[PDB]
Each structure stands twice: as structure tokens, then as C-alpha cells.
Design an enzyme around this catalytic site. Structure first.
Site, mmCIF file in Angstrom:
data_model
loop_
_atom_site.group_PDB
_atom_site.id
_atom_site.type_symbol
_atom_site.label_atom_id
_atom_site.label_comp_id
_atom_site.label_asym_id
_atom_site.label_seq_id
_atom_site.Cartn_x
_atom_site.Cartn_y
_atom_site.Cartn_z
ATOM 1 N N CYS A 1 0.796 -1.102 -0.048
ATOM 2 C CA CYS A 1 0.044 -0.016 -0.010
ATOM 3 C C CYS A 1 0.623 1.099 0.098
ATOM 4 O O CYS A 1 0.395 2.371 -0.396
ATOM 5 C CB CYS A 1 -0.929 -0.092 1.159
ATOM 6 S SG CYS A 1 -0.087 0.156 2.648
ATOM 7 N N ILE B 1 8.621 26.498 7.113
ATOM 8 C CA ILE B 1 9.176 26.151 8.288
ATOM 9 C C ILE B 1 7.945 26.313 9.437
ATOM 10 O O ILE B 1 7.627 27.684 9.520
ATOM 11 C CB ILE B 1 10.308 26.970 8.615
ATOM 12 C CG1 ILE B 1 11.377 26.569 7.481
ATOM 13 C CG2 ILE B 1 10.948 26.875 10.054
ATOM 14 C CD1 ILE B 1 12.544 27.044 7.742
ATOM 15 N N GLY C 1 2.696 -1.283 8.529
ATOM 16 C CA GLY C 1 1.699 -0.221 9.267
ATOM 17 C C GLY C 1 1.365 0.861 8.539
ATOM 18 O O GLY C 1 1.950 1.223 7.539
ATOM 19 N N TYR D 1 -2.303 7.897 15.565
ATOM 20 C CA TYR D 1 -1.117 7.024 15.029
ATOM 21 C C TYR D 1 -0.236 6.735 16.240
ATOM 22 O O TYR D 1 -0.085 5.652 16.396
ATOM 23 C CB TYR D 1 -0.546 7.828 13.895
ATOM 24 C CG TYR D 1 0.898 7.347 13.663
ATOM 25 C CD1 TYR D 1 1.297 6.210 13.333
ATOM 26 C CD2 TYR D 1 2.231 7.946 14.264
ATOM 27 C CE1 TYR D 1 2.581 5.613 13.067
ATOM 28 C CE2 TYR D 1 3.664 7.636 14.042
ATOM 29 C CZ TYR D 1 3.718 6.274 13.428
ATOM 30 O OH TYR D 1 4.935 5.735 13.252
ATOM 31 N N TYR E 1 12.794 17.874 21.115
ATOM 32 C CA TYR E 1 13.012 16.586 21.666
ATOM 33 C C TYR E 1 14.278 15.892 21.268
ATOM 34 O O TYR E 1 14.332 16.090 19.976
ATOM 35 C CB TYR E 1 12.058 15.891 22.355
ATOM 36 C CG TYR E 1 11.195 15.124 21.076
ATOM 37 C CD1 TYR E 1 10.574 15.806 20.452
ATOM 38 C CD2 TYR E 1 11.615 14.038 20.493
ATOM 39 C CE1 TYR E 1 9.905 15.554 19.220
ATOM 40 C CE2 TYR E 1 10.966 13.475 19.403
ATOM 41 C CZ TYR E 1 9.768 14.124 18.967
ATOM 42 O OH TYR E 1 9.191 13.741 17.666
#
Ligand SMILES: NC(=O)c1ccc[n+]([C@@H]2O[C@H](COP(=O)([O-])OP(=O)(O)OC[C@H]3O[C@@H](n4cnc5c(N)ncnc54)[C@H](O)[C@@H]3O)[C@@H](O)[C@H]2O)c1
Ligand SMILES: NC(=O)c1ccc[n+]([C@@H]2O[C@H](COP(=O)([O-])OP(=O)(O)OC[C@H]3O[C@@H](n4cnc5c(N)ncnc54)[C@H](O)[C@@H]3O)[C@@H](O)[C@H]2O)c1
Ligand SMILES: O=c1ccn([C@@H]2O[C@H](COP(=O)(O)OP(=O)(O)O[C@H]3O[C@H](CO)[C@@H](O)[C@H](O)[C@H]3O)[C@@H](O)[C@H]2O)c(=O)[nH]1
Ligand SMILES: O=c1ccn([C@@H]2O[C@H](COP(=O)(O)OP(=O)(O)O[C@H]3O[C@H](CO)[C@@H](O)[C@H](O)[C@H]3O)[C@@H](O)[C@H]2O)c(=O)[nH]1
Ligand code: NA
Ligand code: NA
Lengths: 338, 338
Positions: A34, A217, A82, A149, A299
């Protein structure tokens, strides 16, 4: 070892497969196509220097899964299959839960049926949710992902945990990926998104190749060094390598082994842009736009654990990430052939 | 209205169905009979005073689900179907995730296909996780359930939330049940567990009927009034009623309506025991045992919201819970006939 790699023809999986073959493992790829093309198969074999068996199918197909597993005497499964488009997951939650949550449960149920107990799951940094504490450490408790998700990954991690607890001889690795980028050095395999790319790198690549005007951005007012978002970009080849290592060292080693897969350092949007401009020999066009919905300011991973326990760490640089990307993008502007 | 009630032949669902028919709704029950018998059907009709159509099947069967939905022109679905044995979920996580998580996703996917957008989900207080703040209020953020069973409910709530967000015309109620007990006043319908009952009430009932020796009281050192665990017991008839109301008042009212279903008050193990002794005319035998794994010391619902918004509140008492239970237990010691 005999390994089934779901999602094997995709981005991360293809690279993983190459590295796997290079290490002399027997590879069986299962993908429903897919988000990938059959055209990558020959590339994997070539670059891997060995043939990997391919099976077209869906992880949701328990019976088939079970059959494969047995047919191929698989010893371990690397589960990359997935859906992962964040925004889309917001718009189509069911499909994500189905492909990811039900998708993995059908797969592990097939594993159980076939007696396979070594698994490697493709996880995400988002599972840490809104954690003010950065870098992120495996010892931190998980939080709550903002998109279906992300939720779906957290759900799977939990399910896998419970499964392990109930079937203690199982070896399960939860590999929390940070921000995969890059391409095989050959410039003949890489990320091939269809439509508008959602991640930064590919988008930049599209701008550079002349397909897009300017990179937007998403926000320039973050409490960051330059006001742009900071992340932990990790080269797909390093990622691939970490997968092989994890698979080889954790096979048959009971438990739930969780590891953050990242470089352990952060880079800004600007940093990435600059690296790309340099790599493609021209300034990448860009503009400042408003912050994206649910975007975190910065992060990056704490990757000591993987270092310590698996003796694994990244070796590719940000420049290489950029160079490799441009090389693939530039050598194959239409990506994989239909 | 035309309502599909999954898990309709089970404990809570049967009672719900009776109340539904009594209100003149058209009921279609779908159950796979893994934890119920066909013998309850005639009782439902009788007590409900109207025939409910029954379909044997599995929520996991999307196609069938879709067919039913359409065949019966369903307007709303009450989803009680799933697995709920906590301890067992620890031992068999996959089956829980499959029945509950995948089970609900297949059902809502069928709903989508058939164009049905009104749903009522059977949730649990455990979703609040380890909350020191009691009573528990819908405005509290969820926590993390300790068992795969609890996790599975939380996962569904999340999935449903995301679905609603993506398909905003959907009306979805997340009914957080506290501790259902009791039986229909007729003494001809009630909870019929197979094997060793996991909940307090039925266990007590079994002791009283002469099937069990003594009730083990899981811990007597809690920081509670009498040292025994405290809970929010709610009569199955009240629960049933709350379901009808929720269904009638929220149908076609877009959003995710979350409500705690409880009496809003707590009672100890001892309190329950005493009420039962009184109801069955003899002291219930019991003994103190060590605390159960993962047991919380005390919690109960804050049910103001449902009161306020749905004008719903419990009407049955603890004594009635006990009396009704004993009546059913005593009139039908072998439960529903095979
Ligand atoms: N790419 C990232 O930035 C990122 C970050 C963290 C996590 N992940 C996860 O890593 C894994 C691999 O991601 P990727 O970048 O290679 O994406 P990808 O789309 O390239 O890889 C997914 C592949 O799996 C296949 N697939 C999808 N659903 C399937 C199903 N039901 N049955 C069988 N095959 C199916 C697709 O055809 C595709 O080849 C995914 O599970 C993804 O969620 C990726
Ligand atoms: N009973 C409680 O204390 C408690 C507390 C909170 C939540 N709940 C939830 O409330 C709902 C009803 O619980 P209950 O007490 O009536 O339990 P129950 O076992 O009596 O009801 C469940 C019913 O659904 C059926 N079923 C199970 N899996 C199915 C599947 N895949 N397809 C079709 N039918 C299936 C079973 O045959 C049974 O008739 C459940 O979802 C349960 O988790 C119950
Ligand atoms: O057109 C763009 C794309 C991205 N960005 C910024 O670039 C950074 C990275 O964006 P993106 O590639 O979308 O990274 P992430 O948002 O951090 O998400 C990725 O990394 C996560 C773990 O770090 C995983 O959960 C996801 O699957 C994965 O797509 C962020 O600051 C974005 O704001 C832009 O400014 N413009
Ligand atoms: O043999 C027994 C059974 C129970 N208890 C005690 O009685 C109380 C209630 O026990 P139980 O009926 O198992 O209640 P809960 O543990 O609180 O769990 C129920 O209520 C939850 C929401 O409140 C739902 O998550 C579950 O589905 C449901 O089974 C607790 O203090 C238990 O310690 C005993 O001492 N001995
Ligand atoms: Na066990
Ligand atoms: Na939308």
C-alpha cells in the site's frame, strides 16, 4: 537466522533487509504494497547481495501469517508494517487502529500459533508524550500521544508487554525511533513517499529537486536556540544496523527490551536546511509559517542504553544524512518505477 | 428506536434489553454465546414483554456486522460484547485485545460502512487508573489500567474519541461502569457466571447457596473505615435504565458523551457481606485473606454529571442489590439451562 520482515519493502524495512542479507540471514519480506512498490525488490537483493523471498499480503491476515511463519521456519519477526501518516490518522482513525493495532495482534496471534517467540517492533518517540524532560530515557513512564497514530503505537507496546508477561519465554524489543532520514549510500534506495511528503527531509529534498517551491518552516518562535523545532535525526542506515544487532543479540533472550534509537543529539529545522543546501549545492528555498498543530518544540533521545547493552550507536552524520538523501533524490527523481 | 445490542444475552445486556423492550424499542441482540446461553432469550422476551430478534455471531465479523446493521436498519448500537475476566486477561492478553480492541474496531468499521453513527460503549472505572482523587470525576484525565482488560477499555475509548473527531456527526457515549450487582426483581434473570466467580457479590451468593465454603476477604488492612476494600456497587437494573436514557437522549447528538455510572457512594466488603447475610437469612461465612494483586483500597463514582445532564441517578439500594441477588441465586441455583 530466519527472519520475517513485515513492511520489508518500505523505507526503513528495505534498508533493514539489505543489512540483514549482508549479514547472511535468510529474509522473507511480507508487505501489502500500500506504500511501496515491487520495484524495490530487485534493489534489495542487489544491494544485499542475496535473495530475499517476497510475499505479497496483509498482516491482518492471520491465517496467511501463520502459514508463512511455519512455511519458512521463521525464528524471529521484525515488524515494520503499518500506516504512519500522522495527519491522516487524525482524519482516518479507524484505518490506523485497524492496520496498526489489529494488524499487530493478528501477527502476534499467528506467531503464537506457529510457535514463534522473538519479535522486534517498530515503535515511536511520541510514546513519551508531552515530556518536559529531555532527552527522553527508556526509564521514563510513557505519556499520551496526541494522534491516533501515536496512540496506536503505545497501544501495541502495551499489548506486547502483556503478551510477554503471559508468555514469558518471548523476546520482544520495542524500538523507539526518533526521526529517520537518509538513504543507502548507493543512491539507489531511499525514502519514496507518494504525494506531499509529511516529514522535513523529503520535503526539503523535493524543494531542492525543483518539484516544490519553498519549504514551510512550521514556527520560528519556539524556545529554541534559533526558534525552529529541534529533533533527533537518525540515518536510516544506522537504524538498519541497530535492527540487525537487536535481532541478533536479543533472539531467545526472554523479556521486553526497550531501546531508544536516536543519535542522542538535537538539530534545528534551520540546521537541517543548511546541511541540505550544502549537500545539493544551492540554497534551499524556505519561509516561516505558523506552528503545526500538536508540534513539540524540541526533543531528542538518550541512547546510552542501547550503547551499553547492545554496543550500538550511530555512526552516520547529519551531513551524510543530507548528502545521501540528495543523491537518491537526484539519481531517481521519479523514485521507484511502476 | 432500532437498536443493536451486542453482548445482549450477557449479564448487563440482558437486563438492558428487557428495559429497552419495555420502552417499546426494536431490539436485535448479537452475541457469540461464549459467556451466555440461548436459554436467557425467552426470559428476556417474557420480562421485556416483546420479542427481540437474536443473532448468533461475533463482533469480530465485520461483514456480518455490516449486514445486520443494514438488514435491520439499526439506528443505534449498544456495545456490551467482549471478555472481562481481569485475572484471565493477565494470563491471556491476546484474546482480550482481540475481542475487545479488535472486536470493537470491526464493529465500528461495520457501522461506518452501514452509515450508523450513534454508539454506546460499555466502559470501566479502571480507566481512571490509580487516582488518589476519589470520587472519580469525568473531568479527570485517564490513567493507566493495570490489566490488559482495563487497558483494552481505555484503548477503545481512545479509538472512539479519534473516530468521533474524524466523523463529527457521530454520537458516542462512554459509560464508565463502577461495580454492577443485582438481578431483575423477578428472580428469573441475573448474573450467571461459569466456574469460580471473580466478583464479590456472586462469590458471596455461591457461599450462601451452599456451593462454596467461605468468602475470602482480600485484605483487611486497607486505610478504610473497617479495613476492607470500598467500592461503588450499582444495581444492574439502574445500570440498565441509565442505558436506555443515554440511548434515547443522546441519539443524533454529536459528540463524545462520557458518564460515570455509579451510585456515588462507597460500601465495604463487610458492608456487602452483612447486607447479604441479612438478605438470605443466615450469616455468610467468610475469612480474611491477603490483599489481591493490583487491588485499590477504595473508590466510587461522582455521578453528578449523569444526574445533571441525563436526569439519571440510581434508585435501587444496597439491600435490594443483595435481596435480588439472593432471589435469583436461590430460585435458580443451576442458573440458565443448557
Ligand atoms: N518513518 C518514520 O519517521 C517513522 C518514525 C517512527 C516510527 N515509524 C514506524 O516504522 C515502520 C516503518 O516505517 P517506514 O518509514 O518504513 O514507512 P513505510 O510506509 O515505508 O513502511 C511501511 C510498509 O509496510 C507496508 N504495509 C502497511 N500496512 C500493511 C499491512 N496491513 N499489511 C502489510 N504491509 C503493510 C507498506 O506497504 C510499506 O511498505 C512503521 O511501522 C512506522 O510507523 C516510522
Ligand atoms: N460486569 C462488570 O462488573 C463490569 C464492570 C465494567 C465493565 N463491564 C463491561 O460491560 C460489558 C458487559 O459485561 P457483563 O457483565 O454483561 O459480561 P457478560 O460476559 O455477561 O456479557 C458479555 C457478553 O458478550 C458476549 N461476547 C463476548 N465476546 C464476544 C464477541 N467477540 N462477539 C460476540 N459476543 C461476544 C458473551 O457471550 C456475553 O453474552 C462488557 O463489555 C464488560 O467488559 C462489566
Ligand atoms: O514541512 C515541514 C516538515 C517538518 N517541519 C519541522 O521539522 C521537524 C520534524 O518534522 P517531522 O519530520 O514531521 O518530524 P516529527 O514531527 O518530529 O515526526 C516524526 O518522528 C516521530 C518520532 O520523533 C514519529 O512519531 C513520526 O512517525 C515521525 O513522522 C519539526 O520541528 C517540524 O516542525 C517543518 O517545519 N516543515
Ligand atoms: O472473593 C472476593 C471478591 C472480591 N473481594 C473484594 O471485593 C471488592 C470488589 O471486588 P470485585 O467485584 O472483584 O470488584 P473490583 O475489583 O473493584 O472490579 C469490578 O469493577 C471494575 C470497575 O469498578 C471493573 O473494571 C471490573 O470489570 C469489575 O469486575 C474488592 O475490594 C475486592 O477486594 C474479596 O474480598 N473477595
Ligand atoms: Na502467566
Ligand atoms: Na476531520
Amino acid at each position: 537466522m530466519r527472519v520475517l520482515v513485515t513492511g520489508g519493502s518500505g523505507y526503513i524495512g528495505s534498508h533493514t533487509c539489505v543489512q540483514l542479507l549482508q549479514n547472511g540471514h535468510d529474509v522473507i519480506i511480507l508487505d501489502n504494497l500500500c506504500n511501496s512498490k515491487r520495484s524495490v525488490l530487485p534493489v534489495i537483493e542487489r544491494l544485499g547481495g542475496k535473495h530475499p523471498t517476497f510475499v505479497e499480503g496483509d498482516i491482518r491476515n492471520e491465517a496467511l501469517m501463520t502459514e508463512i511463519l511455519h512455511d519458512h521456519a521463521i525464528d524471529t519477526v521484525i515488524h515494520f508494517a503499518g500506516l504512519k501518516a500522522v495527519g491522516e490518522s487524525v482524519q482516518k482513525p479507524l484505518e490506523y487502529y485497524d492496520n496498526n493495532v489489529n494488524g499487530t495482534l493478528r501477527l502476534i496471534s499467528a506467531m503464537r500459533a506457529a510457535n514463534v517467540k522473538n519479535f522486534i517492533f517498530s515503535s515511536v518517540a511520541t510514546v513519551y508524550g508531552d515530556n518536559p524532560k529531555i532527552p527522553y530515557v527508556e526509564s521514563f513512564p510513557t505519556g499520551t500521544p496526541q494522534s491516533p497514530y501515536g496512540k496506536s503505537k503505545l497501544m501495541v507496546e502495551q499489548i506486547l508487554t502483556d503478551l510477554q508477561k503471559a508468555q514469558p519465554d518471548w523476546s520482544i524489543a520495542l524500538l523507539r525511533y526518533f526521526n529517520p532520514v537518509g538513504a543507502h549510500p548507493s543512491g539507489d534506495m531511499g525514502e519514496d513517499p507518494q504525494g506531499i511528503p509529511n516529514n522535513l527531509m523529503p520535503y526539503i529534498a523535493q524543494v531542492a529537486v525543483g518539484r516544490r517551491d519553498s519549504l514551510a518552516i512550521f514556527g520560528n518562535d519556539y524556545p529554541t536556540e534559533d526558534g525552529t523545532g529541534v529533533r533527533d535525526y537518525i540515518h536510516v542506515m544506522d537504524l538498519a544496523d541497530g535492527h540487525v544487532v537487536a535481532m541478533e543479540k536479543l533472539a531467545n533472550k526472554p523479556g521486553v527490551h526497550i531501546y531508544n534509537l536516536g543519535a542522542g543529539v538535537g538539530n534545528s529545522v534551520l540546521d537541517v536546511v543548511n546541511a541540505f543546501s550544502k549537500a545539493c549545492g544551492k540554497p534551499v528555498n524556505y519561509h516561516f509559517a505558523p506552528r503545526r498543530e500538536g508540534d513539540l518544540p524540541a526533543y531528542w533521545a538518550d541512547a546510552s542504553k542501547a550503547d551499553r547493552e547492545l554496543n550500538w550507536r550511530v555512526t552516520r552524520t547529519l551531513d551524510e544524512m543530507a548528502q545521501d538523501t540528495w543523491h537518491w533524490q537526484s539519481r531517481h527523481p521519479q523514485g521507484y518505477p511502476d
